[PDB]
């Protein structure tokens, strides 16, 4: 469970993933969620801090003096709700449900959200599978 | 950066630790912090969700209908502020700064916070170093 780090500190191998697991559990139970993200008809409840920790777009939105207190954010209605759902689940799990039938929507949504590492991954799967 | 998981999903190796790193950066910059924890004279700013994701005590406090909206929580004034600081840094980093001169305070604070895995680690260092 723990090891001697390169610094003096003892480091816990599973800590970061357990935190994320607990954050996702709080999300499932709707505990301390503080924003609803709307993508066309679909609503997604989340924690602002998790969104800011994974997305350049959400970082910018929630550091804007006008927008930081909003409890509802409406995204571009042309964003595919399934693409967003996949990326949100990714944020809270590290797992990206990338499939032939969603990859383009996922990539487009990741670009919009400024998750450049996921965009780059989608490009690489598109190229390597061509 | 990513691998084929045991499930169908692609999984990102550094995602959970990068999230935690970004959460700690938001804490350093005092971005979206929503609670101050007071331990005697000392104040510690934090995100409720991170505290709830690491501590059974903070989970209970912030799921209590009366206490969940409080922006200041006062802990037992006999809690050692350095012990708390070490545990808070642990929550946001996975690194526990465990030393001869703090181990007892860290263990006592972890018990109070219901971080049983850190208590168990402190016990094991006390035993293995006896």
């Amino acid at each position: 469970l723990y090891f001697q780090g390169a610094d003096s500190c003892i480091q816990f191998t599973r800590h970061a993933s357990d935190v994320l697991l607990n954050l996702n559990r709080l999300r499932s139970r709707d505990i301390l969620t503080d924003v609803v993200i709307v993508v066309s008809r679909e609503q997604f409840r989340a924690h602002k801090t998790v969104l800011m920790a994974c997305s350049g777009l959400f970082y910018s939105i929630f550091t804007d003096q006008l927008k930081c207190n909003l409890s509802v954010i409406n995204l571009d209605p042309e964003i595919n709700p399934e693409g967003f759902c996949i990326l949100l689940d990714f944020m809270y799990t590290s797992r990206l449900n990338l499939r032939e039938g969603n990859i383009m929507a996922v990539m487009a949504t990741a670009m919009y959200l400024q998750m450049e590492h996921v965009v780059d991954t989608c490009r690489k799967f598109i190229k390597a599978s061509e | 950066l990513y691998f084929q998981g045991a499930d169908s999903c692609i999984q990102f190796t550094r995602h959970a630790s990068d999230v935690l790193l970004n959460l700690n950066r938001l804490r350093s910059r005092d971005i979206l912090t929503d609670v101050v924890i007071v331990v005697s004279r000392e104040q510690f700013r934090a995100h409720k969700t991170v505290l709830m994701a690491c501590s059974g005590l903070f989970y209970s406090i912030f799921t209590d209908q009366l206490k969940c909206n409080l922006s200041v929580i006062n802990l037992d004034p006999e809690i050692n502020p350095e012990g708390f600081c070490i545990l808070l840094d642990f929550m946001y980093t996975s690194r526990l700064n465990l030393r001869e001169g703090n181990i007892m305070a860290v263990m006592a604070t972890a018990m109070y916070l219901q971080m049983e895995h850190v208590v168990d680690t402190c016990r094991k260092f006390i035993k293995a170093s006896e």
Binding site: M52, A53, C54, S55, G56, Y59, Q114, M115, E116, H117 | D18, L21, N22, R25, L26, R29, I31
Partner: peptide
């Protein structure tokens, strides 16, 4: 993504 890195928070700046």
């Amino acid at each position: 993504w890195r928070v700046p």
